[PDB]
Design an enzyme around this catalytic site. Structure first.
Site, PDB file in Angstrom:
ATOM      1  N   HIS A 143       5.118  -7.074   2.614  1.00 37.50           N
ATOM      2  CA  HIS A 143       4.871  -5.881   1.793  1.00 37.50           C
ATOM      3  C   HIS A 143       4.043  -6.183   0.551  1.00 37.50           C
ATOM      4  O   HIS A 143       4.556  -6.710  -0.413  1.00 37.50           O
ATOM      5  CB  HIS A 143       6.210  -5.264   1.388  1.00 37.50           C
ATOM      6  N   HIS A 170       0.574  -5.018  -2.142  1.00 37.27           N
ATOM      7  CA  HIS A 170      -0.543  -4.199  -2.679  1.00 37.27           C
ATOM      8  C   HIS A 170      -1.667  -5.069  -3.201  1.00 37.27           C
ATOM      9  O   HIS A 170      -1.495  -5.866  -4.106  1.00 37.27           O
ATOM     10  CB  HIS A 170      -0.054  -3.236  -3.759  1.00 37.27           C
ATOM     11  N   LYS A 202       2.945   3.558   7.087  1.00 38.84           N
ATOM     12  CA  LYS A 202       3.766   3.621   5.891  1.00 38.84           C
ATOM     13  C   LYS A 202       4.105   5.069   5.560  1.00 38.84           C
ATOM     14  O   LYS A 202       3.208   5.921   5.473  1.00 38.84           O
ATOM     15  CB  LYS A 202       3.059   2.982   4.717  1.00 38.84           C
ATOM     16  N   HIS A 251       9.186   3.690   2.451  1.00 40.07           N
ATOM     17  CA  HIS A 251       9.637   3.716   1.071  1.00 40.07           C
ATOM     18  C   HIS A 251      10.730   4.805   0.998  1.00 40.07           C
ATOM     19  O   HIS A 251      10.438   6.012   0.872  1.00 40.07           O
ATOM     20  CB  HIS A 251       8.510   4.029   0.096  1.00 40.07           C
ATOM     21  N   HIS A 269      11.605  -2.770   0.546  1.00 41.35           N
ATOM     22  CA  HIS A 269      12.149  -3.064  -0.765  1.00 41.35           C
ATOM     23  C   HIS A 269      13.463  -2.384  -1.073  1.00 41.35           C
ATOM     24  O   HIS A 269      13.540  -1.546  -1.986  1.00 41.35           O
ATOM     25  CB  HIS A 269      11.134  -2.758  -1.879  1.00 41.35           C
ATOM     26  N   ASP A 322       6.313  -6.768  -2.565  1.00 38.44           N
ATOM     27  CA  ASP A 322       5.856  -5.541  -3.225  1.00 38.44           C
ATOM     28  C   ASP A 322       5.086  -5.884  -4.465  1.00 38.44           C
ATOM     29  O   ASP A 322       5.159  -5.167  -5.434  1.00 38.44           O
ATOM     30  CB  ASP A 322       6.964  -4.556  -3.548  1.00 38.44           C
TER      31      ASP A 322
END
Ligand SMILES: NC(=O)N[C@@H](CC(=O)O)C(=O)O
Ligand SMILES: O=C1C[C@@H](C(=O)O)NC(=O)N1
Ligand SMILES: [Zn+2]
Ligand SMILES: [Zn+2]
Ligand SMILES: [Zn+2]
Ligand SMILES: [Zn+2]
Lengths: 332, 343
Positions: free
Chosen positions: B13, B15, B99, B136, B174, B247
């Site tokens: 996971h 970004h 996602k 999420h 997460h 994350d």
């Protein structure tokens, strides 16, 4: 159009800082409030009559001519504090009250017993601060482990449970006797923790005691709306420079002096409780403290004003509470 | 000084942003991780095969010479997404997963999902073709307390979804609560979860006591200590359907330290050593490799990496900040002395 005329209010919980910041922030209070309880948590704290006297005069120096504003000073309770000093300052009209911030209460029993004897109110920031206690639980825990035992030992002591933030405290105060009172800030009536944390973290809403879950906000709104006459206005206006708020470790405190009174008016109006607004602002506090009500009157008008984005300081700016937002009621 | 050799890990996971920020942050991942699940929440989001191909190549462009790093792309699920487009990206190896971000009735149809019910055709297709769904898992209704939002999602969305689509493979991204840890522990072979370093190391008191700490502000929000301990207990147990997902979610310092701070921790530089620290503290280092390097591959049906990296237990200081073209990034644990680092 709608106008509301009230007895001039007082602010029963205020931070005015010192030096240049004091000079900047006093006028936002002195223009509106007849009196304010000036908290003693300077660096170093105000713990002596001499320090309180000098601080009072610095405050007075910064009050614009034509504002009839009287700072009511407080003593920062410590370990070394001699009960004789506290009582002397009380007897000289220097100290109106003493403030208890979170080595122990038992350590300062003699001081607290002198306060009880002489009729000096105790102002309490009611949180226990042990690293093992969740920050949202600190107020409730204080009631059980400190407030109630204190009040049971010193049954004539007058206590203000400052800036209450919980249903726990609201219930405790509602169900207390005439020697227990509370203040409530505008932020704890207007917001809950969601406002500080949803969609971004908002350090300008970060203050102690921390904003709680909505059920707690609702209990506070219901308490003020009921007309309960031992809750009163205390802004806890607690200014910090912008970049001490907006930083990797933001300071606690809302600079709400510019917007508090109108913000309270909105809450009472929303709660269909404007009949209780004046007493909250201008009568309940004096009654609890045994001081006269103010003999002048001010007017609020329900016309929208945009709050400044910032207020200039010598260095950096100050961001007011509700900066850039619209407030529904303003002081005429 | 102690050495921990492990099969090269992956980050399930991540970004990576885009443009210059991507160029800055990619190396912190590519030096260490063999693969990463690259999240699709760019502005505008990655909702098409073409966008994912182009973004993949921009990420590859930014990988320093010699790093053996492969980005695994995702599709942002939206109301307007054509299930044929999602299927085609999956069949072509472009999309590894999709996602699902929190639903909101006010969301633009091109940028998100109004309700889960409204994207059933797409979720049905994922179930049909064996594509995993990364969730999420928060409900974002204004009247729900932020600390309750994860737990509320489990009841309101997750359990009904999994009951509806029994073949659907889901990662609960997460996780932050005992509620989620329990739910995942008790689930079946089609449910897994990732856990960040910050949610193992810290609780809400660390973000709020003594000052407000925006670099610990992330979503889902840090919870009470009981929740932290539940997470720590879950990873330390050896439970094999929890795995590394950092994350890592970088924002410029000025966007973190502002009147409205952005959510996310830039933990790519320090995550792996932080996980090692947690597993060691939990007396569970024998489960550390599986978490980092085995459990995610097994859930995704991908091979385990056959090269190794070494962590060494020698103290080091984390940088106070990392330069961007404009402004700076403040890494997770900035300025601290950490116990474990990569050799
Ligand atoms: N309320 C705050 O968050 N801060 C106050 C102190 C206090 O009232 O506890 C301050 O003096 O900064
Ligand atoms: O869900 C999210 C989004 C992420 C980001 O900034 O991309 N940051 C977070 O803190 N969590
Ligand atoms: Zn206080
Ligand atoms: Zn205060
Ligand atoms: Zn997320
Ligand atoms: Zn994410």
């Amino acid at each position: 159009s709608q106008v509301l005329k009230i007895r001039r209010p007082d602010d029963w919980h205020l931070h005015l800082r010192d030096g240049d910041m004091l000079k900047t922030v006093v006028p936002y209070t002195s223009e509106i409030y007849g009196r304010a309880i000036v908290m003693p948590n300077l660096a170093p704290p105000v713990t002596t009559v001499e320090a309180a006297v000098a601080y009072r005069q610095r405050i007075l120096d910064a009050v614009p001519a034509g504002h009839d504003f009287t700072p009511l000073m407080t003593c920062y309770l410590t370990d070394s504090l001699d009960p004789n000093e506290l009582e002397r300052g009380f007897n000289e009209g220097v100290f109106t009250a003493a403030k208890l911030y979170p080595t122990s209460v038992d350590a300062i029993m003699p001081v607290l017993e002198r306060m009880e004897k002489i009729g000096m109110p105790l102002l309490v920031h009611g949180e226990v601060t042990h690293a093992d206690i969740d920050i949202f639980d600190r107020e409730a825990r204080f009631i059980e482990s400190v407030m109630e035992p204190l009040r049971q030992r010193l049954t004539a002591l007058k206590v203000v449970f400052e800036h209450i933030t919980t249903k726990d405290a609201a219930d405790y105060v509602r169900d207390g006797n005439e020697r227990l009172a509370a203040t409530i800030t505008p932020q704890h009536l207007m917001f809950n923790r969601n406002h500080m944390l949803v969609g971004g973290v908002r350090p300008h809403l970060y203050c102690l005691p921390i904003l709680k879950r909505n059920i707690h906000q609702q209990a506070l709104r219901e308490l003020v709306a009921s007309g309960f006459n031992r809750v009163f206005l205390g802004t806890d206006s607690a200014p910090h420079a912008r970049h001490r708020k907006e930083s990797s470790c933001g300071c606690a405190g809302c600079f709400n002096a510019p917007t508090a009174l109108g913000s309270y008016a909105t809450v009472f109006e929303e709660m269909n409780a404007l009949q209780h607004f004046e007493a909250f602002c201008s009568v309940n506090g004096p009654q609890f403290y045994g001081l006269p009500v103010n003999d002048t009157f001010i007017e609020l008008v329900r016309e929208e004003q945009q709050v400044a984005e910032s207020i200039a300081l010598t260095d950096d700016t100050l961001v007011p509470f509700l900066a850039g937002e619209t407030v529904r009621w303003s002081v005429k």
